Amino acid sequence: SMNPPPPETSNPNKPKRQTNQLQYLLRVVLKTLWKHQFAWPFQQPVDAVKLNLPDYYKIIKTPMDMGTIKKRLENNYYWNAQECIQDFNTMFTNCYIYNKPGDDIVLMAEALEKLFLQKINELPTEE
Numbered sequence: 001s002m003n004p005p006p007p008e009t010s011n012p013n014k015p016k017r018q019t020n021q022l023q024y025l026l027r028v029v030l031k032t033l034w035k036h037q038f039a040w041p042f043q044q045p046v047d048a049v050k051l052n053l054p055d056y057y058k059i060i061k062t063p064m065d066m067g068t069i070k071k072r073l074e075n076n077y078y079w080n081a082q083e084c085i086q087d088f089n090t091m092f093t094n095c096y097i098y099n100k101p102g103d104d105i106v107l108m109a110e111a112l113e114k115l116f117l118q119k120i121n122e123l124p125t126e127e
C-alpha cells in the first residue's frame with residue numbers, strides 16, 4: 001500500500017486557546033526533544049514506502065510523530081495538554097510495538113522518552 005496521509009494538524013472547527021501548559025509543551029518540551037541527536041527519525045511520519053517497510057501501517061494504525069505534534073501545537077489543535085502528551089506517548093509506544101527490542105530505533109526512542117518524562121514533570125501550573 002501507499003503511505004497514509006499524515007495526521008490532521010489544523011481543524012478550523014475546533015475551538016482555540018492558549019494556556020501556560022500548551023505554550024510550555026511547544027517552547028520547552030517539543031523544542032528540546034526536536035534538537036536531540038536522536039530526534040531525526042521522529043521528526044516526520046514514517047515513510048514506509050521509501051523505507052521498504054510494507055507492514056508498518058498494517059501494524060501501526062495510530063501513527064504519530066513530532067513534526068505532526070509541532071504543527072498541532074502551532075495550529076491550536078489541542079485544547080488540553082493531555083491531548084498533546086497522549087500524542088507523544090503514542091509515538092513512543094508505536095516504536096515499541098513495531099520494532100524488535102534492542103534495535104537502535106528503540107534505544108533512540110527510550111532516550112527521547114526519558115527526556116520527555118523529565119520535561120513533563122516540570123509542567124507549569126494549570127489556570
Ligand SMILES: CCc1c(C(=O)Nc2cc(S(=O)(=O)N(CC)CC)c(C)cc2O)[nH]c(C)c1C(C)=O
Pocket residue numbers: 040041042046047050051053056094095098099105
Ligand atoms: C526504522 C524506521 C523508522 C524511522 C525512520 O525515520 N527511519 C529512517 C529515516 C531516514 S530518512 O528520514 O533520512 N529518510 C530519507 C529522507 C526517509 C526515507 C533514513 C535515511 C533511514 C531511516 O531508518 N522512524 C521511526 C519511528 C521508524 C520505526 C519503524 O519505528
